[PDB]
């Protein structure tokens, strides 16, 4: 049947009862969504060595032994590993990091040795070392003798098993840097899998999976919830569902008596979740994945960036052709460009342009905001530049977008970034984009060949670009029929995109104020031109004249060279 199982028959094949009821394991591939690529990689690394070993023997190679798997907490790493272990239908020995590190002296090593030996005995086997960072942490932080002993025992076992064995070790850790570096060489956890925050489709799939048993009301717009939920890992979505259910219970508490031990089934029949409950849960949700760098997924095309056609085609030639057409580059033996740096007034749409470029080649996107760089400079952040670039390598192809790079490039961090960039593999298609507002202040060492040598100026939007930006920003906002924005666009000469968004914000704020006043007095479904006129009257350019003059002078000077 299914899940290696061989109405009663359908239930048995999954096509006292408490033990299985609370042990609802065997979470197969149908209990995971939004991680199709990572799941495919894990399946390739695991099932093939165990299911069909004859292939590798026929070719005459040794399949990988260790499979490291890291990502933000709450992304389902342990769930994915358990699903793989159950689906492969092969012996597998659990090891929970804290559990092994929570025993009398001289017994943690005993448990590790017993695990490895037993997994060896019943090959094929899958040893799942969970929270490996808690038993083999970074050398400097844990100077305890017992920790060193356990790390050495684990290293000895890992090295000593790679001999005609069908044992595959799968590990889970929050970050690639926490683990001791000694566990990332040949014959060890060499192949690594990075897991990032899901995209809109991933969140929709997660909601579909979790909201299958809940008695939802017919008035649910799960697509809207998926669109609104940004930066939510699977755990946060489960928390959202739980909060919605609790809100429904609280609403229904009026028709129920706390003191009564029994609860009428008729009331329970009316426990229907509503969109309002989900919105309230969003209100009470506390996502935290974005607090640290994570491999995101962007889906912006060449329509959310107005004008700048020359810049768009230049970026295409610089980025897409290598990735899309490597054969021509190999024929001509030309190494593709390794980076590019954007300079210009703030708010001109550099981040959106970089996200669009990343989307074009269908590659993952990593963002490193300036505050994170400063935090790493002060050395009070969990992540690190080496960690960022290691995750970029693992999730290749990727676009790493350093933001507010002026602050660090007025030293340790700059030198470390230079070392990482130099050490990067040229052939591998990983690009580094930079955003800044003080091109002169940027350290010249960065702009050397083999680094962010490409310089791209991002000018202020023109009339057509301003009109396109206005049309884009008002896509989600209702507007009065027959409303023209050309007048606003022409009247907004010299304004940046941020200023246009601010004007839209002010106009909509006035409209909502009018609606609130009218409702309180008791009508305002549309936005009249008066709102925009007043907002423009209460708006001003955010770019100083002197800065614009110096930027244009710098651009001309660079062009002369």
């Amino acid at each position: 049947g299914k899940k290696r199982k061989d109405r009663v028959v359908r239930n048995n094949l999954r096509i006292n009862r408490e033990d299985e009821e609370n042990n609802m394991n065997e979470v197969g591939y149908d209990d995971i969504g939004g991680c199709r690529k990572q799941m495919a990689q894990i399946r390739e690394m695991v099932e093939l060595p165990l299911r069909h070993p004859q292939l590798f023997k026929a070719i005459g190679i040794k399949p990988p032994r260790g499979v490291l798997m890291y990502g933000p907490p709450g992304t389902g790493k342990t769930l994915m590993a358990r699903a793989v272990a159950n689906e492969t239908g092969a012996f597998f020995f659990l090891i929970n990091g804290p559990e092994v590190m929570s025993k009398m002296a001289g017994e943690s090593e005993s448990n590790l040795r017993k695990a490895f030996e037993e997994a060896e005995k019943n090959a094929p086997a899958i040893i799942f070392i969970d929270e490996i960072d808690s038993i083999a942490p970074k050398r400097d932080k844990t100077n305890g003798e017992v920790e060193r002993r356990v790390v050495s025992q684990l290293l000895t076992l890992m090295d000593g098993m790679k001999a005609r064995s069908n044992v595959v070790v799968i590990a889970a850790t929050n970050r690639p840097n926490s683990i001791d570096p000694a566990l990332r060489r040949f014959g060890r956890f060499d192949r690594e899998v990075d897991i990032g925050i899901p995209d809109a489709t991933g969140r929709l799939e997660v909601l579909r999976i979790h909201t299958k048993n809940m008695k939802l009301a017919d008035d649910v717009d799960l697509e809207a919830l998926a669109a609104e939920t940004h930066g939510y890992v699977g755990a946060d979505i489960a928390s959202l569902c739980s909060e919605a259910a609790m809100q429904q219970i609280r609403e229904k508490m009026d028709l129920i008596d706390l003191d009564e031990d029994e609860i009428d089934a008729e009331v329970l029949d009316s426990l229907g979740v509503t969109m309002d409950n989900f919105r309230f849960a969003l209100g009470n949700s506390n996502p935290s994945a974005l607090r640290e760098t994570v491999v995101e997924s962007v889906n912006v095309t060449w329509d959310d960036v107005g004008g700048l056609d020359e810049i768009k085609e230049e970026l295409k030639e610089t980025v897409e052709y290598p990735v899309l057409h490597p054969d021509q580059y190999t024929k001509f033996g030309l190494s593709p460009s390794k980076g590019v740096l954007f300079y210009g007034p703030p708010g001109t749409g550099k981040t959106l342009l970089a996200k669009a470029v990343a989307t074009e080649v269908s590659a993952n996107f990593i963002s490193v905001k300036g505050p994170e760089l400063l935090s790493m400079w002060y050395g009070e952040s969990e992540s690190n530049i080496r960690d960022i670039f290691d995750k970029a390598r693992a999730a290749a192809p990727t676009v790493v977008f350093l933001d507010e790079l002026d602050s660090i490039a007025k030293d340790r961090v700059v030198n470390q970034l230079l070392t990482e960039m130099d050490g990067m593999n040229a052939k591998k298609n990983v690009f580094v984009i930079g955003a800044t507002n003080r091109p002169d202040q940027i350290d010249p060492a960065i702009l050397r060949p083999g680094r962010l040598d490409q310089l791209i100026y991002v000018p202020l939007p023109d009339e057509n670009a301003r009109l396109s930006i206005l049309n884009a920003q008002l896509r989600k906002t209702p507007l009065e029929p027959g409303l023209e924005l050309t007048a606003i666009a022409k009247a907004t000469q010299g304004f940046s995109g941020a200023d246009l968004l601010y004007i839209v914000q002010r106009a909509a704020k006035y409209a909502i104020k009018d609606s609130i006043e009218a409702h309180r007095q008791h009508p305002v479904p549309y936005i009249t031109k008066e709102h925009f006129a007043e907002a423009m009257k209460t708006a001003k350019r955010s770019v100083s004249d002197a800065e614009l003059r110096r930027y244009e002078a710098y651009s001309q000077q660079m062009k002369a060279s």
Binding site: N86, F91, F92, F93, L94, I95, R113, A115, E118, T156
Partner: protein, 474 residues
């Protein structure tokens, strides 16, 4: 040797080493995983699991399981080393030949050939687990000696080893018969010339080996009757007082060192002789229950280089001093205080011997199970060296014992009266019989399927001459 050493030991050790002893366990209620796959609580229990023992009231870990623990702890297969031998007996004798540049010990000693401090600590593996007496008569007659005479006794015990299921990979020593050496027993003690005793025991051991037995221990009685009208004895040996005084421990250690256990996993090939010592003193009540003990490996190697001697305090062993040809380093005996903390106390003046013992468990075979006794005997012909009592082996005793049955028949009765240890030894000393004649005698007396062998024996000329002389003698 590029691998395991090559040497032959008893069959029991081989069969034990064949097994694994893994104790299976079922799905605990604490497991969170599918049917297949085991986390930390469903894994098979190793045979040396300390918790399992102390939970089952087993105090030591059945040496073979200790060997399994040591092999698992190290010796990775196919790589990582070239098989460093896991077991090695202690040796405290100072290396007379070190020569970093210094001369022999008497006039020079470096820091490389200086016996480091010795840390006594109670042993954890007992080589032989269960000492088992085939028939209670074996010890009943031994005690009867003291009953009649009143003086103490002492005797070696012959037998053979076998498996013992009740303990993980455990061994039992089954004793078939007891042999008494010539001793000058007294009221408070006993005395026996060592040289003559060993000279006699050499040939007695040769004959016993010819019979298939082997020397597996010494048993002596420490019994003193109380004033009660019926049979009651004071319990001088219990937790309050000593279990085995220093002298008995010394003698047991000497004997153990003189009967090495040949093993395949040591540099020298031997380790921790299987030689149980039993003592009879009486439990807290008036019974005459027996006990068993075995000195730890350190005490075995601590007395080869002298370094221990008896003390007026029964439970403490005095320590000797340094001198040429004998270097005695500081001795620390490590106990655990009531707060669960290990404490090292220097004991040069004297230390308790309870750190130089491991206890066994005596017993008797179930009285309704299979009887594989070699000898249906121990009530008949007088035992060997009971000259002091009226007992005296001689021709007229044989005439009174095995003449009426021999002259008529009753091959069942003849067999039951012919499978006696001491009778066989005495008729062997008679030398009336030829070598192969005595071989067939023993094969008829100490074996099943004995019809044709006994018929051959009687048909022989030697037996005819023996019965003729028996008839001639009064």
């Amino acid at each position: 040797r590029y691998g395991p050493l090559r040497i032959k030991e008893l069959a029991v050790d081989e069969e034990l080493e064949k097994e694994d002893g893994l104790i299976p366990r079922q799905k605990s209620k604490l497991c969170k995983h599918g049917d297949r796959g085991m986390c930390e609580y469903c894994s098979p229990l190793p045979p040396w699991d300390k918790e399992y023992h102390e939970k089952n009231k087993i105090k030591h870990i059945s040496f073979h399981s200790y060997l399994k623990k040591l092999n698992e702890n190290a010796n990775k297969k196919e790589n990582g080393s070239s098989y460093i031998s896991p077991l090695s007996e202690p040796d405290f004798r100072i290396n007379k030949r070190c020569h970093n540049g210094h001369e022999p010990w008497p006039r020079g000693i470096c820091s490389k050939c200086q016996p480091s401090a010795i840390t006594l600590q109670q042993q954890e593996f007992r080589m032989v687990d269960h000492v088992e007496f085939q028939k209670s008569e074996i010890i009943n007659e031994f005690i009867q000696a003291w009953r009649y005479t009143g003086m103490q006794r002492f005797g070696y015990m012959y037998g053979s080893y076998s498996k013992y299921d009740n303990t993980p990979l455990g061994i039992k020593a089954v004793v078939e018969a007891i042999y008494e050496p010539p001793q000058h027993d007294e009221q408070d003690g006993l005395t026996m010339d060592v040289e003559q005793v060993k000279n006699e025991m050499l040939q007695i051991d040769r004959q016993a080996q010819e019979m298939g037995l082997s020397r597996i221990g010494l048993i002596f009685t420490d019994l003193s009757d109380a004033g009660a009208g019926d049979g009651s004895v004071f319990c001088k040996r219990h937790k309050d007082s000593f279990f085995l005084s220093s002298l008995e421990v010394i003698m047991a250690a000497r004997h153990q060192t003189r009967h090495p256990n040949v093993s395949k996993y040591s540099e020298q090939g031997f380790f921790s002789s299987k030689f149980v010592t039993c003592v009879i003193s009486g439990n807290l009540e008036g019974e005459i229950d027996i006990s068993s003990y075995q000195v730890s490996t350190e005490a075995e190697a601590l007395v080869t280089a002298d370094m221990i001697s008896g003390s007026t305090f029964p439970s403490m062993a005095y320590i000797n001093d340094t001198t040429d040809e004998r270097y005695v380093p500081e001795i620390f005996y490590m106990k655990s205080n009531e707060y669960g903390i290990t404490v090292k106390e220097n004991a040069k003046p004297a230390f308790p011997v309870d750190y130089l013992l491991v206890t066994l468990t005596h017993g008797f075979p179930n009285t309704d199970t299979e009887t594989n006794s070699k000898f249906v005997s121990s009530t008949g012909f007088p035992w060997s060296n009971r000259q002091a009592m009226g007992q005296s082996q001689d021709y007229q005793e044989l005439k009174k014992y095995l003449f009426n049955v021999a002259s008529s028949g009753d091959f069942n009765l003849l067999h039951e009266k012919i499978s006696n240890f001491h009778l066989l030894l005495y008729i062997n000393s008679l030398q009336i019989l030829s070598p192969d004649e005595w071989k067939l005698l023993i094969e008829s007396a100490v074996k099943n399927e004995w019809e044709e062998s006994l018929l051959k024996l009687v048909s022989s000329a030697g037996w005819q001459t023996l019965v003729m002389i028996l008839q001639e003698s009064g």
